[PDB]
Amino acid sequence: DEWIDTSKIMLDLHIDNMSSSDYIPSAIDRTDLVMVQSVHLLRKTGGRGLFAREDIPKGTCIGIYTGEVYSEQEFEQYLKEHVGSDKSYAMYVGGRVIDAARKGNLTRYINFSDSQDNAEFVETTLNRKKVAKVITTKNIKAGQQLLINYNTYEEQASRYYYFLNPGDGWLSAQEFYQTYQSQYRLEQMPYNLEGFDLKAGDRVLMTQIGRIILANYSLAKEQELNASDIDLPFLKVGSDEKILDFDEADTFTPLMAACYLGQVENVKWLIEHGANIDQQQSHSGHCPLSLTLKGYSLAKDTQKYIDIIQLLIKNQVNLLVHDRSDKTFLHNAALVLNNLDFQSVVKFLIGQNPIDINEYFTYIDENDFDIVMHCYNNKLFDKALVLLAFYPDYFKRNYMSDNEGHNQFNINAFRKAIKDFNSNERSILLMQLRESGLHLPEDLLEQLG
Ligand SMILES: C[S@@+](CC[C@H](N)C(=O)[O-])C[C@H]1O[C@@H](n2cnc3c(N)ncnc32)[C@H](O)[C@@H]1O
Structure with missing residues (x-):
């Protein structure tokens, strides 16, 4: 420990805003591969980011997410007694909280993205206890920014963050x-x-x-x-x-x-x-x-916009991208595309034979509506059917899973989605649900209202 010079670690990483006694290295940190720089987009708050110094192959371990260690009770009490504290740099892992708001290593500088992330936290063992490793999830060119997806808790990232790109630099x-x-x-x-x-x-x-x-x-x-x-x-x-x-x-x-x-x-x-x-x-x-x-919404010739949608899907565009309302592509396409075109675009996606079809049906917007709930809240019954045809296991996977907490959440969200339906609108909904071929049990149809 006398043999660890963190001062020279920080100088080599170009970290200029930590005390040497606040820098906590792990043995597998790869300072040779990475560097800290300002992110110019974030200059108003002096924000930094972690960047590649050279090319980094997919699957490379960058380091361990180090920081101060708390039990969940100790950390909840920490937040209470420190005015202005938050979970910005706090990671809940292995039954503990690791917080890098004051102390940690190079990994505390990696910023957020949920559509262009190029690394991830992976659980690993460190002296009989559970922490997180950072592994790159795709090839990184020198000078590109490392981005990562994690639970942003109360920060309302979708509303207030920048949509960062790996080419966003200093x-x-x-x-x-x-x-x-x-x-x-x-x-x-x-x-x-x-x-x-x-x-x-x-x-x-x-x-x-x-x-x-x-x-x-x-x-x-x-x-x-x-x-x-x-x-x-x-x-x-x-x-x-x-x-x-x-x-x-x-x-x-x-x-x-x-x-x-x-x-x-x-x-x-x-x-x-x-x-x-x-x-x-x-x-x-x-x-x-x-x-x-x-x-498309403005077009005279709408078909060319459909052909462009097809082209993007054929080249694996990330359809899970979302706006500041947390509406994904399929959320918004349902509002903007007409029935034939919506049907047609879903058919393109079918043709790609996706592995996890459920992942499109799992992202919820600011109103807690997934894409099916979203259609119903907007009286888009035919759109809903296209999605239901697309994914038959929809109700089974999200309303009748092994997780009753999650099940009941979706049931309540669904009720919320149709809470303004009239005499006639609830019956057409009930009608299509039964000839769907979804085989919904009676008790599910009931608590769904
Ligand atoms: C783990 S820190 C990332 C390193 C931080 N930029 C720094 O200089 O220390 C997470 C914090 O960085 C900022 N941040 C991360 N990603 C962001 C983004 N995409 N847009 C705006 N701010 C972001 C937010 O202030 C967030 O609370």
Whole structure:
């Protein structure tokens, strides 16, 4: 312990905001692979993040989540007696609480995502007791940010966090631009784009590929294109002729614009050449799926937006992505798509023969409604049937499982979802439930109201 110099650990990690006696290493920490940097998006609160110093293969162990150790009772009493304390850095694992709000190691710097996470907490043993390891869940390029999914308790992450991307770094927008200066050119918007809060005459820094998308030309037709321009974002410029920093305005990529404008072949081109199909705008959350849906809602030709939905699904887009209301793709598609198109999109998903169909039916919105409850709350009976056909085990897996706590929660949520139904609306619901082929027991139909 006399042999452990945490001061040089922090210097090597570029950690500048911890006391050396607050740094708690584990024997399997890999400081050689990672580094702490500012996340420019978070500059207003001086937030940091953990980043890769080199390429990291999928499945690599990064370290142990260390911190102060409490029993659940001791930690509940800690929160009570320390004004301003929270569960921000607290992990409930192995019957204890590990809290890294004051003390811990490099793993305390990893930020949150539930749609672009590239690492995970895995339970491991450490001197006869249970803690968590951080393992990468996909390949990480040098300079990309480590992101992780965990229980954010009372922080209301969906409402208040940024939608972080692995390419969100320590550079400002201005520094970002000068790094790729040769690929960029200042343009004026040739028309309005309400999808990205742009008006004709707004100045936007964009690439050749960008220009081509806004011109509605074909990317395939072009023969001198640069590979960097694939995902180089449009950067908006302010009324004072200065670049809008990352936390002052959302950027958007070529793929995002192609999807919003309904450009099928350009979407297909951009997917194949490595565009991040799950990229999210930091403040708004808009992604290629959501922008495609928005395009659809305004479209003259709705079919091209459907073909783009099909293309994203064919390339395993994360359909579990959600907005700030906690509505997933299937939540919102049910509101925006007409019956034929909703049916058709569910058919695409069927064609992918998903392993865990239940995972789509498990994410609940801010109202506690999963996607089936969501349809019913919106009088979308035909949509509901399409989902029920899609997933027959829906009621069985979520209302009649081995977990009565969970079962009763879903039963109450369901009641909540239909609590405004009228004389007629509860009978049509009851009708389709029985000819469904779902074989619902009488006692379930009753406590469902
Ligand atoms: C485990 S810490 C992550 C490291 C933290 N950024 C730091 O500099 O110490 C979790 C806290 O980081 C911030 N955070 C993590 N992910 C975030 C996100 N996606 N958007 C906004 N803030 C985030 C929140 O303040 C949260 O309470």
